[PDB]
Write a protein that holds these residues in place. Structure first.
Motif, mmCIF file in Angstrom:
data_model
loop_
_atom_site.group_PDB
_atom_site.id
_atom_site.type_symbol
_atom_site.label_atom_id
_atom_site.label_comp_id
_atom_site.label_asym_id
_atom_site.label_seq_id
_atom_site.Cartn_x
_atom_site.Cartn_y
_atom_site.Cartn_z
ATOM 1 N N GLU A 174 -5.110 -2.869 -3.609
ATOM 2 C CA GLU A 174 -3.160 -2.898 -2.567
ATOM 3 C C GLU A 174 -2.609 -4.659 -2.285
ATOM 4 O OE1 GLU A 174 -3.870 -2.432 1.871
ATOM 5 O OE2 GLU A 174 -4.312 -0.765 1.600
ATOM 6 N N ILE B 245 7.797 6.860 1.450
ATOM 7 C CA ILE B 245 6.501 6.464 2.468
ATOM 8 C C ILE B 245 7.148 8.465 3.114
ATOM 9 C CG2 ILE B 245 6.485 6.045 4.625
ATOM 10 C CD1 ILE B 245 7.944 3.160 3.924
ATOM 11 N N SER C 75 0.990 -1.465 -0.391
ATOM 12 C CA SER C 75 -0.019 -0.198 -0.096
ATOM 13 C C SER C 75 0.502 1.081 0.488
ATOM 14 C CB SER C 75 -1.162 0.034 1.006
ATOM 15 O OG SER C 75 0.436 0.031 2.093
ATOM 16 N N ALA C 76 2.148 1.619 -0.228
ATOM 17 C CA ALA C 76 2.848 2.539 0.072
ATOM 18 C C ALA C 76 3.032 2.903 -1.353
ATOM 19 C CB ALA C 76 4.088 1.844 -0.089
ATOM 20 N N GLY D 48 3.720 0.182 10.067
ATOM 21 C CA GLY D 48 4.531 0.413 9.346
ATOM 22 C C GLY D 48 5.859 1.214 9.673
ATOM 23 N N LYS E 161 3.029 -2.127 4.015
ATOM 24 C CA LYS E 161 2.977 -0.150 3.984
ATOM 25 C C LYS E 161 4.211 0.113 3.972
ATOM 26 C CE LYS E 161 0.725 1.473 7.113
ATOM 27 N NZ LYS E 161 -1.045 2.132 6.302
ATOM 28 N N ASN F 132 2.241 9.245 9.386
ATOM 29 C CA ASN F 132 1.676 8.008 9.244
ATOM 30 C C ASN F 132 0.770 8.190 10.828
ATOM 31 O OD1 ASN F 132 1.103 5.747 9.886
ATOM 32 N ND2 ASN F 132 2.191 4.417 9.365
ATOM 33 N N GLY G 171 1.888 -5.149 8.872
ATOM 34 C CA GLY G 171 2.641 -3.088 8.412
ATOM 35 C C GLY G 171 3.433 -3.841 7.296
#
Ligand SMILES: N[C@@H](CCc1cccnc1)P(=O)(O)C[C@@H](Cc1ccccc1)C(=O)O
Ligand SMILES: [Zn+2]
Length: 864
Positions: free
Chosen positions: A71, A91, A51-52, A101, A120, A96, A117
């Motif tokens: 995702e 990122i 999902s990054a 993550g 992420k 966040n 996580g």
């Protein structure tokens, strides 16, 4: 999207090697991955979770053809043999607020990957049966990020002329992605070591803020104790020459066992006597132990899939309980553990979110880090120990590691290791993993001839996941008392003894305890030998006999608990009938004996003077008015307070004397302080005006935080302005210590004063409060949600408030919001007026566009 255990399939791909590169800048961090991928089912698409923000993807060094959907990243054109994939993501850790993550906290960078996580951070096969060897390179500005950590061994590093530096960490042990960690920041280090039983030094490093370093000493000692204990008790040795622990002030949970690099909530690593209570110290010891014990039960052997979470958590909780028990005060700590299970796990099993210790399905796995998986999970492990003995249990442990070291396995595999190592059949035992709900045992006893005849029936109720429940394997440890409270011997399975474990395997069984020549009262479920409700027809006089004379701590304490429960029931009756309160003659006699008993351990005595919580008291009821139960429980406490007031002062005086100015944490000093604080609570209930005398000498008594917390707790419900003044002075005194400010906000949220809701709303705007900090949100709002008279106010104001905060918090932290929303779990058991209002609150939460899966799953279980 529901996930089902029945649908499990081994992965199409393995990842043999995970090479990571973190380039930390302002504001972005760029992550490069290189995965060495081994096909298992040749030709299948490679599916990567993530999902990054995605910048690029290569296969075998060439730009990849792929598709990004939700995702997931899917590469259809896969080589048929070993190949590599390289992913580049970006990122923004300061944005966040989910704390999963890679995220920012206190100007530094931390990770939390369990359960899901890691996706992420980069695109990965982010599931725990995929184990890979990680090597992690980290590059950052040196002055801003002088400390750069990841799992394993630091094998290289260097400097650049532009002020940046780098490090490379190699973790040689294959691991699932949930055990990855990274820390980057300006942190102070505390150094120590431990030498293993094979003669290898292990460097120990605890990282904290500069200001926090003086509070990390007890955690360091606790780790060294935990290392030694795992060797002597389990024969388990650490497997690296470095063990790092990092404290972080922004953290969703308690701590995390990432290999060689544990990350801890400040709460479970920082203490000194000025700022932490004895209970906080005990908590640090438990959780430092817990995370270290995971190195074998979790890391070396891990989980095939997340439905098997209890394989590592039930077992590791058992391990941390046994560690603490071996350190000090085993019986008292055991009761504390039982009390927590019944106050918090039993309502879960009775409620809409009930699940088996090994769930069969879930929507969001973060919702299943539960009392059931953890604490009931530990009771299930402990029943292996009760059935097998310590030596047999260790045979099972030994075979488990022999078979499964380096593997990702199941609850079934642990059971089989236990069964096979001891040559016994534990097939029926499997139902402790698959059947939800609290079993109920009905028992009856008669002495016919020279045989004590104990009949026991079991039933297990339907739960929302499953109606059919089959008989379970339930060990019931028992003994007999004569009229003099002396142990009586009996014969069972050709053995004369004072104690036996009766193994109930059928819906109904009769156990014959032969050779009994005098009238007896049975002692039942000793040590809380199974996690069940047991009903046996005891008279009040029977309960006094048990309380006075039984040789088992739990059964003694349970006899007291039962007298309290009966007294509250009697109060409910009179208050309902609009008449004078009961006399509780037998109870008072019992408490009088308890107070005056000089042979009782002081911490045990404290437990005997604890009254069951409202939730225990309304267990099993329909159409609940929580305020009626609260009123009844309060009336009982008022009676005990006013009735025994001179002994509360006397006991307080003795506790002060015997504490002997030993203000540092020790179990001996702590037990005196525990008793002292029970006395303080009662004294101030009987005589609210005593607060002004307390306030005049507050400085004198404030010799550690256990005393300040004990005092502020005792006065917290006081309607004097002095309560408000003392609390304001506490906040001023400790304004710079975030863990102490947590205590302030908990006192604000938990007060039985009439004005708590408005004080809570003011506290939301306190300069040291932050809604985005889970410790703070939990302390103020979590406490309010557990504040029975305010949360369950008839006008619905408590429900509206908590629903507002679930809604607000879900926008940035679904895990905190989903824990909070479970304040509504009692919904369908409430009387109609509150039930109506709770339903309105939940429908309003449900109406929010963009509501997380986390909160959505819980709301559905309650409403639908
Ligand atoms: N694996 C960790 C939980 C991660 C998590 C947690 C929640 C949601 N997602 C992921 P833990 O079990 O070792 C620590 C426990 C604390 C604890 C320690 C000892 C005994 C019981 C619980 C906790 O932090 O919950
Ligand atoms: Zn754990």
């Amino acid at each position: 999207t529901v996930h089902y255990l029945k649908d499990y399939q081994t992965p199409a791909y393995h990842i043999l090697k995970t090479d990571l590169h973190f380039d930390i800048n302002e504001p972005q961090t760029v992550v490069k991955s290189r995965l060495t991928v081994e096909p298992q089912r040749v030709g299948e698409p490679l599916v990567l979770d993530g999902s990054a923000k995605l910048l690029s993807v290569k296969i075998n060094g060439a730009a990849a053809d792929y598709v990004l959907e939700g995702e997931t990243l899917t590469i259809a054109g896969v080589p048929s043999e070993r190949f590599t994939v390289e992913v580049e993501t970006e990122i923004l850790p300061a944005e966040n607020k989910s704390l999963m993550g890679l995220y920012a906290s206190g100007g530094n960078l931390f990770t939390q990957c369990e359960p899901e996580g890691f996706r992420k951070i980069t695109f990965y096969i982010d599931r725990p049966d995929v184990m890979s060897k990680f090597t992690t390179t980290i590059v950052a500005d040196k002055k801003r990020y002088p400390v750069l950590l990841s799992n394993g061994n630091k094998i290289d590093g260097g400097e650049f002329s532009d002020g940046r530096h780098w490090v490379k960490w190699e973790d040689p042990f294959s691991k699932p992605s949930y055990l990855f960690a990274l820390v980057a920041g300006d942190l102070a280090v505390t150094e120590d070591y431990f030498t293993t039983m094979s003669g290898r030094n292990v460097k120990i490093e605890f990282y904290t803020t500069e200001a926090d370093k003086p509070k990390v000493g007890f955690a360091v000692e606790s780790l060294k104790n935990a290392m030694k204990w795992d060797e002597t008790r389990f024969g388990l040795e650490y497997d690296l020459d470095i063990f790092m622990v990092v404290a972080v002030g922004d953290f969703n949970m308690g701590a995390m066992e990432n290999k060689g690099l544990n990350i801890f909530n400040t709460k479970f690593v920082l203490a000194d006597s000025r700022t932490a209570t004895d209970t906080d110290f005990e908590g640090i010891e438990s959780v430092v132990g817990h995370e270290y014990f995971h190195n074998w039960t979790g890391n070396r052997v891990t989980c095939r899939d997340w439905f098997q979470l209890s394989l590592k958590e039930g077992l590791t909780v058992f391990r941390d309980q046994e560690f603490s028990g071996d350190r000090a005060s085993r019986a008292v700590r055991r009761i504390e553990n039982i009390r927590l299970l019944r106050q918090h796990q039993f309502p879960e099993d009775a409620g809409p979110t009930a699940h088996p210790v090994r769930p069969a399905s879930y929507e969001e796995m973060n919702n299943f880090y539960t009392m059931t998986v953890y604490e009931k999970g530990a009771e299930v492990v402990r029943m292996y120990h009760t059935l097998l003995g310590e030596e047999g249990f260790q045979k099972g442990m030994k075979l488990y590691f022999q078979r499964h070291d380096g593997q990702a396995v199941t609850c079934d595999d642990f059971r089989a290791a236990m069964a096979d190592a001891n040559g016994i059949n534990l097939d029926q035992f499997a139902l402790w993993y698959s059947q939800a709900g609290t079993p109920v045992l009905e028992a009856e006893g008669r002495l016919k001839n020279n045989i004590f005849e104990l009949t026991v029936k079991q039933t297990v109720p339907p739960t929302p996941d499953m109606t059919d429940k089959q008989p379970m394997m339930i060990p019931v440890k028992v003994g007999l008392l004569n009229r003099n409270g002396e142990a009586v011997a009996f014969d069972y399975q050709g053995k004369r003894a004072t104690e036996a474990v009766l193994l109930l395997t059928e819906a109904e069984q009769t156990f014959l305890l032969e050779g009994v020549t005098e009238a007896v009262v049975p002692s039942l479920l000793r040590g809380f030998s199974a996690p069940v409700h047991l009903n046996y027809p005891y008279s009040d006089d029977d309960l006094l006999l048990l309380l006075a004379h039984d040789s088992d701590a739990f059964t003694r304490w349970e006899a007291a608990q039962t007298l309290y429960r009966r007294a509250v029931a009697a109060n409910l009756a009179t208050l309902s009938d609009g008449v004078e309160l009961p006399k509780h003659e037998k109870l008072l006699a019992a408490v009088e004996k308890v107070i005056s008993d000089d042979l009782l351990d002081n911490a045990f005595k404290a437990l005997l003077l604890g009254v069951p919580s409202e939730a225990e008291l309304w267990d099993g009821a329909e159409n609940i008015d929580p305020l009626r139960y609260h009123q009844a429980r309060e009336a009982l406490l008022d009676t005990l307070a006013v009735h025994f007031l001179p002994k509360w002062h006397e006991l307080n005086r003795q506790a002060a004397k015997q504490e002997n100015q030993s203000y540092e944490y020790s179990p001996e000093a702590a037990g005196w302080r525990t008793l002292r604080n029970v006395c303080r609570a009662f004294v101030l209930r009987a005589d609210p005006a005593h607060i002004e005398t307390v306030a005049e000498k507050y400085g004198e008594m404030a010799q550690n935080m256990t005393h300040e917390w004990g005092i502020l707790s005792a006065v917290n419900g006081n309607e004097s302005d002095t309560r408000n003044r003392l609390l304001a002075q506490f906040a001023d005194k400790f304004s710079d210590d975030a863990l102490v400010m947590d205590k302030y906000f908990a006192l604000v949220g938990s007060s039985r004063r009439s004005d708590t809701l408005q004080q809570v709303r003011t506290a939301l705007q306190h300069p040291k409060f932050s809604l985005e900090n889970p410790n703070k949100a939990r302390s103020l709002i979590g406490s309010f949600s557990r504040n029975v008279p305010h949360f369950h106010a008839e006008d619905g104001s408590g429900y509206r408030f908590i629903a507002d905060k679930v809604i607000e918090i879900d926008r940035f932290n679904p895990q905190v919001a989903a824990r909070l929303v479970q304040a509504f779990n009692l919904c369908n058991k409430l009387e109609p007026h509150r039930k109506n209002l709770v339903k309105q609150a939940l429908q309003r939460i449900r109406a929010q566009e963009g509501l997380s899966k986390d909160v959505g799953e819980i709301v559905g279980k309650i409403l639908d």
